[PDB]
Amino acid sequence: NTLQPGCNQACYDRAFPISHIRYWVFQIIMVCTPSLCFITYSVHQSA
Amino acid sequence: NTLQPGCNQACYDRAFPISHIRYWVFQIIMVCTPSLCFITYSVHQSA
């Protein structure tokens, strides 16, 4: 509720520094990483 | 600097309850009143 240009951008950036969806995507990939490491180690161990 | 309807009216009314010009007009007429009273009393005293 204002007429000042640029207030919307600043206030939105302050309210939500990082969107929830991106945080959850990062969490999912990071949590799945160790299984990938184990799988590639197993593949390396053979041939 | 706002988008709220009616904020301009309220804020202007609070800033300037009475305009200067109207106060000065009232002052001029009120200050001139006693001379009018004296003149009309003089007119009445004759005829």
The DSSP result for A1-47, as a single string, is: ----TTHHHHHHHHH-SS-HHHHHHHHHHHHHHHHHHHHHHHHHH--
Residues 6 or more apart whose Cβ sits within 8 Å of residue A17? none
Closest-approach residue (CA) in chain B for A1: B3
CA distance A5 to A32: 43
| Way the structure was solved | cryo-EM
Closest-approach residue (CA) in chain B for A2: B2
User: What's this structure's resolution in Å?
Assistant: 3.0
CA distance A31 to B6: 54
* Backbone torsions φ then ψ of A46, nearest 5 degrees: -110, 125
**Distance (Å) from the alpha carbon of B10 to chain A's nearest alpha carbon:** 17
Taking alpha carbons only, the member of B8, B9, B3 closest to residue A5 is B3
Q: Are A6 and B1 in contact (CB under 8 A)?
A: no
Asked if A1 lies within 8 A of B1 by C-beta distance, the reply is no
How buried is residue B46: exposed, middle or buried, by Cβ count under 10 Å (0-12/13-18/19+)?
A: exposed
For A34, A38, B25, the CA distances from B16, given in Å and listed in that order, are: 70, 76, 16
